Write a protein that binds this ligand. Sequence first.
Ligand SMILES: [Ca+2]
Ligand SMILES: [Ca+2]
Length: 291
Amino acid sequence: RESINPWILTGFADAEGSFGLYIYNRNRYTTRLRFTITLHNKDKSILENIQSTWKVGIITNNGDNAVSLHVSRFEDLKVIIDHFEKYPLITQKLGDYKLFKQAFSVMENKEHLKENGIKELVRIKAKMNWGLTDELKKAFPGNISRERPLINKNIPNFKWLAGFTSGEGHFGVELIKNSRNSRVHVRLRFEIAQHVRDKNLMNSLITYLGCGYIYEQNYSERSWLRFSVSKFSDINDKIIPVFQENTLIGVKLEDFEDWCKVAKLIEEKKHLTESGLDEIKKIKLNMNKGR
DNA sequence: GGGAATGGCAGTATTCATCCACAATG
DNA sequence: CCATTGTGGATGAATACTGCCATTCC
Ligand SMILES: [Ca+2]
Ligand SMILES: [Ca+2]
């Protein structure tokens, strides 16, 4: 139950944190400010480590297979705000944080208890996440601006990347089938997935790491990006050294370790033998979704 | 003591992680 | 022919994010 490096924490928050402002009609209006991280059960240790680092927030069972860290206590939200002022987000979520902070200022002056303050908060919430609800849209009609200044920041350091990869990353051992034979070959893959809205950040991964490609997929109004590396030299020389030096967190750390085992076997060309390929096929079976 | 704050979850939509096919390349 | 590398395909659930009653407290 250790504590997490602050920049790793910011990286993970950029990946899977959420800043919320919630307004519902009571009988007037109730207003709540909340930071939330929702993860699969297997990574409850992450939430505990985050909790151990901030000394705020509650950890709750969320359904059958998920757990959540909730921070709603107003005094405790100060702790969060101060962290992200010293170690700032760099994805578009930073915009949500800014609005989160602006709403915090309104409530600190107790102005959410007056009608004029509510109208300010509604304007803020309109630009946050999924925006206003239909209750709010009906109660406050017209086109409330959803527009928001676009965030354009570089990756601060590798500690941030390790936190962000701990959330959005993928370390895969792939068995390549061909058509004229039945023997399979091994290929290692590193991937990072993200919505198109952070296209500039994703493209910078190529330069920042020194390898890889950016691919886009599109399904109706759905689209996302994929930073992808396959060339073994780059994976062995440019990806593995980075995460060995900057440690991952959660279950995905164990995936990276098994990933490196396979890489060492490929490096020693033991994967072209049959005792080696067998051990690799075993390691593949028990990592990622197989674990 | 009534409402404001916070706890304590369950719910919903999708942005992710993931396993995979097949073509291209030397 | 073999081994590596490239370009995404396609999936479904782990996320992001939200809704609301219960409890605290002041
Ligand atoms: Ca994310
Ligand atoms: Ca994740």
